[PDB]
Amino acid sequence: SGFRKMAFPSGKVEGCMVQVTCGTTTLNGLWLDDVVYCPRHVICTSEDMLNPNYEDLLIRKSNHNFLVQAGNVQLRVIGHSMQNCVLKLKVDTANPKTPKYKFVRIQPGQTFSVLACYNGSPSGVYQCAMRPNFTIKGSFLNGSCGSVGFNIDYDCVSFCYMHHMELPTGVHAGTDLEGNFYGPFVDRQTAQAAGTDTTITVNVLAWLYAAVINGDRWFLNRFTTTLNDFNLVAMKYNYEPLTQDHVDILGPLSAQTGIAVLDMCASLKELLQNGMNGRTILGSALLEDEFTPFDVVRQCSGVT
Amino acid sequence: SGFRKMAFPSGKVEGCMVQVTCGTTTLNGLWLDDVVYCPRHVICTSEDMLNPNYEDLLIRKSNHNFLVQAGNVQLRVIGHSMQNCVLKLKVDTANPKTPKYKFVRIQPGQTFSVLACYNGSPSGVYQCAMRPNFTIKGSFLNGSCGSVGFNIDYDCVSFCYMHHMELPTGVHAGTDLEGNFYGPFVDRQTAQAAGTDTTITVNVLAWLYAAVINGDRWFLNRFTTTLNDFNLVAMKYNYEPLTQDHVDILGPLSAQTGIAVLDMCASLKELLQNGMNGRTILGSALLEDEFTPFDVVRQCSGVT
Ligand SMILES: Clc1cccc(CN2CCOCC2)c1
Ligand SMILES: Clc1cccc(CN2CCOCC2)c1
């Protein structure tokens, strides 16, 4: 019993983190097989960062300008290319600690763990969601660029995020491991405003199920609603619309608890309309939206 | 920028987790050098667990009754002893993945990471505090016993906790790695009530500093207070007393932010007296008490 914001064990990803230096800029790289992946802005002087031309800047760089250090041993760079907003440094040594892995592009509302790193060294691990506005609410200081987000399925690391930017509003933007930004962000020091940070409705419902399973039930009410009626309330409170796909995904939690999805929607509706009246749910005074239905099933069933 | 409930990277501890089976009971063990540490109740049939005599039960056990599996390879047990509430299984192989490590007994209010494990396999990592009543608010299902709590200082794992018990109230109890319980709990299926779960005042103040550093300042007020006056308010709200030791420990955060500790105490006092009036601090609607002053400095400075 008990429910915690839980990250994947980070060991498999720790063994992939390296330090990348170009000129005077140091950040983190991901060493998988004989390739190191890092943000392309490693080639920038923060001066460049106002309106950088990455193709033109990269002309002036050679394999031997990219200094790649795995612990305290230097990797020999034998090739470099740009793919979107990441650099791929071909090294002469396959990472012996390469786990089975995939690159995935996640959708907003999906959750992942971040291994926050500085100078190729892990500092900590926490669990995030891709916000509906394609930002993440991370903890990232200077030098944390190239820190990665991931999911683990048994022995297989799915890399979904690499850290690039902090917005002037202190929220974070980054790429998939093909270097394509989540959302409309560019790797440029410019005016970039995030859109509306809406609540991930299906995750809140999942977390209300998790609450019932763990004994927190005060918010269960006598009411039900419809998808359309619920979705009117959701829109008023900047909650994402709930789809039939979201209802289907919540089925197992529905099945386990014997509380129909639309009944739980009517409980959430009352919580939106009435607030918590100073009460708490799984030790939170707000509606948590960074657990997926899959996360609740996983944590509640004990999957390793 | 941004502030997250961050755990230590778990790799160093992942490589110490093994499966321990005695008769029909499987739980987790910690393999350090040529010793595996596990909860002694591994020798119990849940029948035993009502009033077990561990000395008498252990008479009936031999080295070859303790089945120790590290991944999918069996460890040869060449000795066993009981120290308090843990078993130490001497194996014939030193764990090649043994990190530099210490065993520490933490005090209430101190924080650590838990690697939740099932059948010797890591499932996830989260950050905890030892509650003032010597419980922890974990996420632990059957099979999670022998999961450990730890801190990392550069390359050195300090093990502070091993999981043993869930109380009928769904809070968790365990031992240091010498097998001594935190608090008055015994490894017996009996009536064990936790004491008052008070708030760790010094941690809330640390987290209010973390909030100011990250831009959340609405709660800063025009007031100051005294230690004695603050402590009257703390007692009314089941907050732990604030000592001069706590004030001294908050010094660096005081220094960085230029907000005197007693000024921040007067801000906390108003938050206790008036509540959040529907506002949030670092994305929480309650006062977070599972960051130490050390945790705020670490996360805010980027220590690896
Ligand atoms: Cl993370 C990711 C996101 C989108 C597509 C893909 C697959 N690739 C395969 C190679 O060429 C291009 C597409 C991966
Ligand atoms: Cl975790 C821990 C808690 C309390 C004391 C100690 C030190 N030991 C050294 C060996 O003998 C007994 C005491 C360790």
Side-chain angles (χ1 to χ4, degrees), chain A residues 1 4 7 137 139-140 299, chain B residues 1 4 125 137 139-140 299:
Chain A
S1 202
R4 275 281 179 179
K137 296 172 156 153
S139 175
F140 288 116
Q299 173 163 177
Chain B
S1 202
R4 275 281 179 179
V125 61
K137 296 172 156 153
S139 175
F140 288 116
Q299 173 163 177

Side-chain angles (χ1 to χ4, degrees), chain B residues 83 103-105 176-178:
Chain B
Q83 181 177 18
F103 295 167
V104 295
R105 198 177 170 76
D176 62 26
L177 267 289
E178 297 192 322

